[PDB]
Amino acid sequence: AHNGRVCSTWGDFHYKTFDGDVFRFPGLCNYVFSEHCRAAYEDFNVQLRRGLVGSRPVVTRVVIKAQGLVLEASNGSVLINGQREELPYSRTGLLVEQSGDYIKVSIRLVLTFLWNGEDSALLELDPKYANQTCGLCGDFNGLPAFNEFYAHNARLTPLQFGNLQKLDGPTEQCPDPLPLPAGNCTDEEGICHRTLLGPAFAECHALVDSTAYLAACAQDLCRCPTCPCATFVEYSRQCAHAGGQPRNWRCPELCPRTCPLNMQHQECGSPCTDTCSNPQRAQLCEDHCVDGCFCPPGTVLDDITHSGCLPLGQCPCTHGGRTYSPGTSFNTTCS
Amino acid sequence: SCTCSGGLWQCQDLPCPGTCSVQGGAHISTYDEKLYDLHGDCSYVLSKKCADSSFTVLAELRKCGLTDNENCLKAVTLSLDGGDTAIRVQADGGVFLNSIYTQLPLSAANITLFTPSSFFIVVQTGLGLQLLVQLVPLMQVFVRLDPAHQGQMCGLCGNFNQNQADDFTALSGVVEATGAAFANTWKAQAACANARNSFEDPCSLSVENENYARHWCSRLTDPNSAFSRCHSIINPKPFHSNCMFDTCNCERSEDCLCAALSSYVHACAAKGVQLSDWRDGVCTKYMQNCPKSQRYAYVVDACQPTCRGLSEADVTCSVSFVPVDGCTCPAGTFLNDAGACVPAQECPCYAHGTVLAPGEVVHDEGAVCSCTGGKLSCLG
Amino acid sequence: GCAAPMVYLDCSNSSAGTPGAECLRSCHTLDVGCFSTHCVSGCVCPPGLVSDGSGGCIAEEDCPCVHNEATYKPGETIRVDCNTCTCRNRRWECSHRLCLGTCVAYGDGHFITFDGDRYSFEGSCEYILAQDYCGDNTTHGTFRIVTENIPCGTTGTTCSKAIKLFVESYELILQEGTFKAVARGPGGDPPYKIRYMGIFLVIETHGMAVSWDRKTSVFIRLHQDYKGRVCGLCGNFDDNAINDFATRSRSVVGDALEFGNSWKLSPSCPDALAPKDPCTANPFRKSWAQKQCSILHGPTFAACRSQVDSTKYYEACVNDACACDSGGDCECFCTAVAAYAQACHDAGLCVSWRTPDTCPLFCDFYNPHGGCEWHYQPCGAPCLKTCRNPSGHCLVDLPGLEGCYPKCPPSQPFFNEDQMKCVAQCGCYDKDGNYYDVGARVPCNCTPSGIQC
Amino acid sequence: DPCTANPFRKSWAQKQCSILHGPTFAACRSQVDSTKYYEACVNDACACDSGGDCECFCTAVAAYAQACHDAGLCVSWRTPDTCPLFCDFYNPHGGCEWHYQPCGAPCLKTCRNPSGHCLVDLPGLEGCYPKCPPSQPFFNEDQMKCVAQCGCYDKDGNYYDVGARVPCNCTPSGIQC
Ligand SMILES: *[C@@H]1O[C@H](CO)[C@@H](O)[C@H](O)[C@H]1NC(C)=O
Ligand SMILES: *[C@@H]1O[C@H](CO)[C@@H](O)[C@H](O)[C@H]1NC(C)=O
Ligand SMILES: *[C@@H]1O[C@H](CO)[C@@H](O)[C@H](O)[C@H]1NC(C)=O
Ligand SMILES: *[C@@H]1O[C@H](CO)[C@@H](O)[C@H](O)[C@H]1NC(C)=O
Ligand SMILES: *[C@@H]1O[C@H](CO)[C@@H](O)[C@H](O)[C@H]1NC(C)=O
Ligand SMILES: [Ca+2]
Ligand SMILES: [Ca+2]
Ligand SMILES: [Ca+2]
């Protein structure tokens, strides 16, 4: 599956590259998150600007340039080639949606960009861009520990690596953030060890190693105690993406989630929700686990009138812009 | 000059001093006007009368950023008399005579160094070549040659023989292919790294850089713009490409942008057009940053009016250079040895190097003298 | 503290300012003379030698010669244009054969005149691409070439050209895919010869060879005799490119529009207005254009980009692929790239891009029923043993150029252009140049001699 | 509607699509109804206003070409002026197996199918095929050439040369160990 074609940005300036490296780079301006930069003609150019909400590290603007299309997501709005658009916006090859808890931009054969709109932002890239990319997401060559931080044969540090991939505005001179002093707190109560190493991610231990995630959990624990679950959610995403099936680690206290009345919050539910518009969509799907709201098995989602999830036998039909409740009939002159 | 006769234009040529230039730290316009880009990091022999070692203008181009194609000019080292003399103009304005700091002006061995304005430095020599070096907003170089040296020079700026196909003649007797391949034969130090050909336009990187550079550099080719007066004389397409490439690639986008616009203006004024008032809503931080008591001027076409000069003449003001713009004292004012700008009434006449205050009657050698309006008069 | 003959040099003992390891006698800096105000310590060859740049020591009379980013050992030879140089004592000694001047008129109006100047001019009327009919005496001149932009299916963006090759009293109109002849003056033998050079009509005049791609690019190659005595839109061939914008009245201008407007045949024709930048006009093509034109930066043209400067060619490609918004896009991109292809072909390289996905060239077409003479050669033979030229010799030997040629076997060793086939015995051409099969009377019969009676 | 959107292409479009009414497609126009194919051709040539025009016209005409091929005919339009198809490309230095056939063989003795039989015997269809001589009678798709002996295809369908180990070696039998 999406083994090594994923990168992400989460929590307190935590960057996970394509080949598994995690680091922290507390920048506060624009950076080349990824760019087709080892080819005759560029295909994609995705950048992030990271700012602050009071104190929480957030992404304040993303600019994805791809194949003559400019997509700027910021301020809860999306700009397509300079024009605001209402989600979802679909065109040949490109589709952008408010799907789930995020804003997702999928450019077919190019990339998949998930953006929760506050902190996280995840890139899936095609295998064909192996070794031809460069940015905070890494080189996509498959070797984690040897080729990212070696510029002109000199091994360099996360601050250095995140500052090399910098890009100022036309009239802007953003500084470089200085190294943060030593850490404290750690995982005292063991919450990171209790959860991350808990049963919920058992097989996830067989796929994605949690050492960096453990450290990031501790570091976030040094930050506010209402923001420690970003690392957990990111580990769930990564375990799902490597191929494994995460389990529901959430509890009414562990960053609880709320969903509509008929609709439940699941970790690793099928991404193709069966909806009695296409009640057998989930038949031969090919897509890994996805977190979000779902319906209990047996009852499909009702997208025709948005009445929650309904049983297969009680949901409406549609004909020519008309919605028909169950029990209704309409007769044409011939049928 | 062309006369309308015989149903045609009968054209004769007045002698024309050739003009090399390095603009943006990367682009080079040679004597044959073969514009080419050079992204190198070494000292390059900008020009040299390659029969002898009479003069040798050197330029040190230095990489200024993350990208290998981010260069700035950093020095101009006129070697002379086969290396016996070396006038080195840096990028901050510091002028080193034989590797020793030397303020400006300086007049010795027929060499005259002076600043027409705060933006430019003039290194005039009697050997034939004149250097006019720009410091504001960044470092650019211009070279003028008395046409006598036609078809004799070597170096980056080409042999000056009115042929654009021979400009890449190397020392091996063949025309080189591209810019960088030609330049890497003229490096000063064997240890330098060879320049590399650059296809990737930095303009494609940032959309905000895109729109900024486009909206400003488009002021060149606008037929209603101040620059239109030179369009019918100089084709502004290379200058627009330079402005685009600079601003997109320049970390200080405004600096390289205004450098490109200044370069276009200065080239056109070299051809004999007085482009004026082109900084509308652009590059005005170069209006304001002037030294105190000075002021901007668009047509600075002579020496700088000085109290010493009006008192006892000056070798400086006997040099003809293309009218550059920059910061100077306004007309009717002069800068004393202190450098402050005062009217003529406040600055003194100087006799034998003695400060003789204005409006002061004195006795000397059986004579009575007066200092009226900075002017010295003596009677008896 | 070194190993090979080059030994360490330290600046601690020497007085400050000596030329150190940076000013090392080298295959390049032996000549220019090194400049450095700061000595640096390093390993330097013993006196009498230099370094190769890689830590060796070589005598000064075997230093490799560098040309176009390459490096050549002494004893190696290279070909520049039409001549060949050899590397000796850090120099090139080249044969002194004259090389034909070249004018190139292609695309939406790009011109590369004889003197190497480049510009763009979008003209719509008839423009004198060359002539000897400019001088204090016009009548000692011989030839004249006019071109104008044909649209092939509409009245819009250009799709092809129309050439008028006058030669003294003869005339040849090149349009619509082939040639004609409107010979009006004295009726002697042709002062020209016609050949099917790959995808080109080539017309020679023993000192002036015109090659037409049959759609929109014209490459004219002149002998050195005509130097300084021609004019039009290919300059005046004087090895002085600054003044090549010399109009009808020889008032050198700094503008392309006036220079083009000067050489229109009929003064009644309206002057072309300001040309408009294509990509700005139609932004929605630009991306595609770049993706199409990026072929010039890819490894297909990696080698040639070091032998031929491809900046202006790329700008031309992008402009043309942006401009052709009314139809026929592949032809625009194909010819924009093919101008660079011919530049590479003439320079030193037999580059073959032309992939089935990108600018394909049907060459199986003239292969009848499994016959496999017709093959695509990226550089055609200098002369063709054509049906019209049974000798096999040629007057203005053009070098290789793209297109497909027949490998005519000994059993059928005559390439016939009027049927495009390798055959055994040729037919006949009359004065006007029409063809007949042998054994046919002409408006005399056709025989092994030809038209005889 | 495409032509209404971009009238300035429209004329060109018709000139390009008129190939259907010409003597090139004289015979087939009586074997296959070509009103709708022509309408599609013109609409496609009108629509492709963002680049790649010849491909649009080529495929619009080639659908009709295949319809003629399937009906009863072997029609060969494909002029060097009109929708050329570079088929000399796979010819190695004069080797001339690769020839353009307007109607191909029903089944190809390919590298992957050494038997020469096929499951769904398709009729002729445009494209250029190699006249693989008896000396080199195997058509290899991954390299597009006539060769003497084939290599091996794994379960996923990747190809290797004989004697090369698979992530067992390759032999006349195939992948064995
Ligand atoms: C986002 O945009 C809204 C208006 O659409 C504005 O009121 C708000 O201040 C912006 N910023 C945030 C953080 O919501
Ligand atoms: C990956 O990129 C490096 C960088 O030069 C190159 O040396 C290596 O061969 C490449 N390998 C692959 C498999 O792309
Ligand atoms: C057609 O449907 C309407 C709506 O239910 C119904 O009233 C009518 O009787 C139907 N026509 C028949 C049954 O013929
Ligand atoms: C000018 O140059 C000449 C020749 O080198 C020299 O003799 C003279 O001293 C210099 N200065 C003046 C003022 O002539
Ligand atoms: C050539 O022109 C000159 C005047 O420029 C004239 O005197 C001479 O007679 C002309 N010669 C011929 C052969 O026309
Ligand atoms: Ca790596
Ligand atoms: Ca020259
Ligand atoms: Ca000329």
mmCIF file of N, CA, C and O in Angstrom, chain B residues 4 10 35 63 69 120 127 144 147 155 159 175 190 194 207 217 227 233 235 238 245 260 262 315 337 347 353-354 379:
data_model
loop_
_atom_site.group_PDB
_atom_site.id
_atom_site.type_symbol
_atom_site.label_atom_id
_atom_site.label_comp_id
_atom_site.label_asym_id
_atom_site.label_seq_id
_atom_site.Cartn_x
_atom_site.Cartn_y
_atom_site.Cartn_z
ATOM 1 N N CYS B 4 19.604 62.250 -45.748
ATOM 2 C CA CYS B 4 18.583 61.798 -46.693
ATOM 3 C C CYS B 4 18.945 62.286 -48.088
ATOM 4 O O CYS B 4 18.681 63.436 -48.444
ATOM 5 N N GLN B 10 22.321 58.047 -46.726
ATOM 6 C CA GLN B 10 23.770 57.958 -46.832
ATOM 7 C C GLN B 10 24.336 58.060 -45.424
ATOM 8 O O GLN B 10 24.280 59.125 -44.804
ATOM 9 N N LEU B 35 24.707 39.683 -25.565
ATOM 10 C CA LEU B 35 24.227 39.474 -24.209
ATOM 11 C C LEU B 35 24.250 37.993 -23.868
ATOM 12 O O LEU B 35 23.805 37.159 -24.659
ATOM 13 N N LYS B 63 28.810 33.667 -5.411
ATOM 14 C CA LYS B 63 27.490 33.085 -5.228
ATOM 15 C C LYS B 63 26.860 33.598 -3.941
ATOM 16 O O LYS B 63 27.499 33.626 -2.889
ATOM 17 N N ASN B 69 22.848 29.393 -9.055
ATOM 18 C CA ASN B 69 22.662 30.483 -9.993
ATOM 19 C C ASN B 69 22.273 31.784 -9.306
ATOM 20 O O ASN B 69 21.666 32.651 -9.943
ATOM 21 N N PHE B 120 27.565 55.767 -7.913
ATOM 22 C CA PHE B 120 28.526 55.363 -8.926
ATOM 23 C C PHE B 120 29.929 55.827 -8.567
ATOM 24 O O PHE B 120 30.114 56.828 -7.873
ATOM 25 N N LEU B 127 45.004 55.124 -20.320
ATOM 26 C CA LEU B 127 45.308 54.018 -21.220
ATOM 27 C C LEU B 127 44.196 53.749 -22.218
ATOM 28 O O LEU B 127 44.409 52.985 -23.165
ATOM 29 N N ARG B 144 33.983 51.438 -20.677
ATOM 30 C CA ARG B 144 33.995 52.192 -21.919
ATOM 31 C C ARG B 144 35.388 52.138 -22.516
ATOM 32 O O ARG B 144 36.380 52.259 -21.798
ATOM 33 N N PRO B 147 37.472 53.773 -29.173
ATOM 34 C CA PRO B 147 37.385 52.777 -30.250
ATOM 35 C C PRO B 147 38.712 52.390 -30.879
ATOM 36 O O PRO B 147 38.753 51.504 -31.736
ATOM 37 N N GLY B 155 39.160 38.499 -23.323
ATOM 38 C CA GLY B 155 38.438 38.442 -22.070
ATOM 39 C C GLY B 155 36.961 38.175 -22.254
ATOM 40 O O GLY B 155 36.475 37.841 -23.336
ATOM 41 N N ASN B 159 36.281 40.607 -28.153
ATOM 42 C CA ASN B 159 37.413 41.280 -28.771
ATOM 43 C C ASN B 159 37.068 42.619 -29.404
ATOM 44 O O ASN B 159 37.959 43.248 -29.980
ATOM 45 N N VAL B 175 35.470 29.314 -31.637
ATOM 46 C CA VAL B 175 34.351 29.976 -30.988
ATOM 47 C C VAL B 175 33.700 29.013 -30.005
ATOM 48 O O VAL B 175 33.311 27.899 -30.374
ATOM 49 N N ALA B 190 42.955 28.657 -11.108
ATOM 50 C CA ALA B 190 42.693 27.297 -11.564
ATOM 51 C C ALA B 190 41.841 26.506 -10.586
ATOM 52 O O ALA B 190 41.237 25.503 -10.979
ATOM 53 N N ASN B 194 33.935 25.339 -12.251
ATOM 54 C CA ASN B 194 33.441 25.751 -13.555
ATOM 55 C C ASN B 194 31.982 26.169 -13.473
ATOM 56 O O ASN B 194 31.178 25.539 -12.786
ATOM 57 N N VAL B 207 4.656 31.698 -6.562
ATOM 58 C CA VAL B 207 3.606 32.414 -7.274
ATOM 59 C C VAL B 207 3.563 33.877 -6.851
ATOM 60 O O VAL B 207 3.269 34.762 -7.664
ATOM 61 N N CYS B 217 8.337 44.389 -13.288
ATOM 62 C CA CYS B 217 9.172 44.363 -14.480
ATOM 63 C C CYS B 217 8.386 44.608 -15.759
ATOM 64 O O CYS B 217 8.989 44.956 -16.777
ATOM 65 N N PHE B 227 9.750 54.441 -19.991
ATOM 66 C CA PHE B 227 10.756 53.738 -20.773
ATOM 67 C C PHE B 227 10.441 53.696 -22.262
ATOM 68 O O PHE B 227 11.341 53.407 -23.060
ATOM 69 N N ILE B 233 14.582 52.693 -29.866
ATOM 70 C CA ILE B 233 16.030 52.727 -30.033
ATOM 71 C C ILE B 233 16.680 51.446 -29.527
ATOM 72 O O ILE B 233 17.477 50.821 -30.231
ATOM 73 N N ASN B 235 15.883 47.650 -27.968
ATOM 74 C CA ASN B 235 14.873 46.628 -27.752
ATOM 75 C C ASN B 235 14.899 46.207 -26.291
ATOM 76 O O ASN B 235 15.928 45.709 -25.820
ATOM 77 N N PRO B 238 15.679 41.863 -23.798
ATOM 78 C CA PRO B 238 16.700 41.327 -22.882
ATOM 79 C C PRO B 238 16.644 41.961 -21.509
ATOM 80 O O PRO B 238 16.866 41.281 -20.504
ATOM 81 N N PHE B 245 14.350 37.512 -14.333
ATOM 82 C CA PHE B 245 15.244 36.524 -13.746
ATOM 83 C C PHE B 245 15.794 37.013 -12.417
ATOM 84 O O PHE B 245 15.808 36.275 -11.427
ATOM 85 N N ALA B 260 17.780 46.236 -12.236
ATOM 86 C CA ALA B 260 17.453 46.018 -13.639
ATOM 87 C C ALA B 260 16.908 47.284 -14.282
ATOM 88 O O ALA B 260 17.280 47.628 -15.411
ATOM 89 N N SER B 262 17.418 50.407 -13.308
ATOM 90 C CA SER B 262 18.545 51.316 -13.424
ATOM 91 C C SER B 262 19.444 50.932 -14.585
ATOM 92 O O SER B 262 19.968 51.801 -15.283
ATOM 93 N N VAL B 315 41.089 68.636 -11.442
ATOM 94 C CA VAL B 315 41.295 67.659 -12.503
ATOM 95 C C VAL B 315 40.068 66.780 -12.680
ATOM 96 O O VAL B 315 39.795 66.317 -13.793
ATOM 97 N N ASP B 337 35.120 70.532 2.610
ATOM 98 C CA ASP B 337 35.936 69.379 2.965
ATOM 99 C C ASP B 337 35.265 68.536 4.037
ATOM 100 O O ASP B 337 35.495 67.324 4.109
ATOM 101 N N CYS B 347 31.008 78.622 2.289
ATOM 102 C CA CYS B 347 32.222 77.848 2.120
ATOM 103 C C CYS B 347 33.379 78.756 1.728
ATOM 104 O O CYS B 347 33.179 79.744 1.012
ATOM 105 N N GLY B 353 46.231 76.069 -0.016
ATOM 106 C CA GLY B 353 45.666 75.107 0.900
ATOM 107 C C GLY B 353 45.197 75.681 2.215
ATOM 108 O O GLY B 353 44.810 74.912 3.102
ATOM 109 N N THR B 354 45.216 77.002 2.374
ATOM 110 C CA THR B 354 44.772 77.633 3.609
ATOM 111 C C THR B 354 43.287 77.945 3.534
ATOM 112 O O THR B 354 42.806 78.522 2.555
ATOM 113 N N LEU B 379 44.150 91.723 -5.331
ATOM 114 C CA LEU B 379 44.379 93.035 -5.913
ATOM 115 C C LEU B 379 45.720 93.577 -5.444
ATOM 116 O O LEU B 379 46.161 93.303 -4.321
#
